[model samples]
Target: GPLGSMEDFVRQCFNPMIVELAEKTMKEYGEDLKIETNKFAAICTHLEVCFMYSDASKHRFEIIEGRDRTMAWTVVNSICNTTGAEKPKFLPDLYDYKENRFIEIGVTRREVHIYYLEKANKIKSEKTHIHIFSFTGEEMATKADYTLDEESRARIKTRLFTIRQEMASRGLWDSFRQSER
Candidate 1:
């Protein structure tokens, strides 16, 4: 019903002792803890909502979106002490451009991208982490004949076959196709 406190989250949810125990067990079996540690650190590096790798002398990560990069900065600050990453020097100024032309429809997930900050190289040649952003495509119309489930989807497929047959006869399939159309 309600989340009580931070202590409850730590005590009930985060099994750090168990984690350590597993680490010990794995180590007992001749696993390299240093490599494991480094790999874990790298994974943690990649887990940021958004991040950039900067390398001049040594490799370090910096946070982007400190001002308006809300999700990215929130994740970075949660792990790092503060906003360690900086906005892409040669990337899009905004995550969602203008938000006027394109209607925003959110999904239950997010898109994350990472990149290597080059010292004097062009941005295009820089290493990148890519996140594919997909949403339930532009919703113009929904066949209200059934619920949107697998059984419902099967029904739609059957209906689709019927429509294909009819449309093939009438050239409707060649005209155009959009969920809205």
Candidate 2:
């Protein structure tokens, strides 16, 4: 109802032990030094809300540099890296839209297996793009299969729609517009 306080969110959303340990450490160490712990507390608690409220638990969450702009993405990355669930995988593609070609570039040593989907959500763009983040069936990427299931596609589109709506409400969606990044 109140969405509760940050302390309430931390206590109820995450494990009790995490809350106790964090409070204990801050009190024992930070209290003596006159350090402010609110920033750290704010970040941790925010990530917890992101984790519980998104589809990161069901499928792969993007690990992107700009994830912090959207709490849903931020939460997804935190959970994925923290738990190693649905392990970070990349479906690499470099699109040359002018030439009508979609191709994969060789994975380089610098590459960290994080794929960036095509940029969407510009005011000028006519299409509402939904890049497939989660697959339905029991196969991991090695190559493409045309066997994309209808049911799985439907479920994923719904999730993406919900995520976009939340971001828009929070004013986080504005960062996605072209010429901003």
Candidate 3:
């Protein structure tokens, strides 16, 4: 059996809505735009797809990626001034790896497979809408803790905050991956 158009749903429904919602959240929190965009870009990167603008000529951007390269300052300036997400680096992996006392938080890799009736109804309502973005998270599983649990989320937030502070001090995020496994 064939499945539905997931990407269409993301573009027409999920992304448009998610982008607006997330951006709004960022502004309310006094977050930076690049940081907000990075967060979105991080999600999009994991999704293994790029955004191609239909009205490129008027917008003068073939793709968000292109604009970020050529008009890098726009994204950095706009987002930095308006939100809490900071300026996004051109390449996330181009981190200053010399610090952290030579610590290597190597990129982790893992995959997940889900079994379900292709014709089944109530997909997202039941067992899915799982982010099959990239091959990462081996220990990632389905269970009662998947919501990451409040305590776990809080703990991670503290860790992330700490890392963010260091990144700010260094004027770059050198040791952390935008998304975690």
Candidate 4:
């Protein structure tokens, strides 16, 4: 049987998987989880992935925009800061880091993992592709994909407010405002 389009795959397959995994993790680990949106690039040029562990450490994931200092990174780091997670590690040289179409997420008591599609071949074949590898480049099972939400969202909002306060304290906020025409 052929899998449907990317949208279909995400809505029917991916979303359910993510929800299932999130719920399982929540029950087992007692951590809240969220997903902002299921939107993802059908063809990722510069993939960046993020992994959040129970111990509060994150590993580099996919960044489709291909930049180290992206707004997504900013938000993730901010969430980590708010949650007391360690800063993410730098991107490593990956053997197959091009044209990633989708991502897989895994959760465990020790770690929460996120991995990107390694190459275009999997998608080209139009098959149900499973099995996401690790940062160490080993094959592993994907459990869930999620983001911080609700109470965590409130915390992030407060964190942003504190950042704004810091900018205001330094007069940078007004300065930037004045400079912005």
Report lDDT per candidate: 0.28, 0.33, 0.31, 0.30
Candidates' TM-scores? 0.17, 0.25, 0.23, 0.23
Please write out the lDDT profile of model 1 over residues 1-181, one tens digit for every residue: 2323322222333246433443444454576545443222212212211221111112233333222345544543443333333334343211322111111111111221111112113333222232221121111111121112345334333433443344335443333122211
Best by TM-score: 2
lDDT of model 4 at position 116: 30
Candidate 4: pairs in clash: 34-147, 47-62, 47-63, 48-61, 48-62, 48-63, 49-61, 49-62, 50-61, 106-143
Clashing pairs in 2: none
RMSD of each: 21.6, 14.9, 20.1, 21.2
TM-score computed on alpha carbons, candidate 3: 0.23
Evaluate model 3: give its lDDT: 0.31
User: In candidate 4, what are the lDDT values of residues 1-181, reduced to their tens digit?
Assistant: 3322323322443335444533443444444333211122111101212222111222322321222335546754554465554443432212112222123222111111323343223333232223332212233432322233345334433433443354445444443223311
84-170 in candidate 3: lDDT tens per residue?
Answer: 434443312111111101000111222333221221122323322121212222222223223224454344334335434544454
Off by over 4 Å in 3: 1-14, 42-137, 141-181
lDDT of 4: 0.30
Give residue 65's error in model 1 in angstroms: 37
> Mind giving the per-residue lDDT tens digits that candidate 2 earns over 95-179?
2222222222211111122321232212122221122232111222223331235565445445444533543454433332221
Candidate 4 worst ten-residue window by lDDT: 37-46
**What is the model-wide C-alpha lDDT for candidate 2?**
0.33
* Candidate 1 Cα misplacement greater than 4 A, ranges: 1-149, 178-181
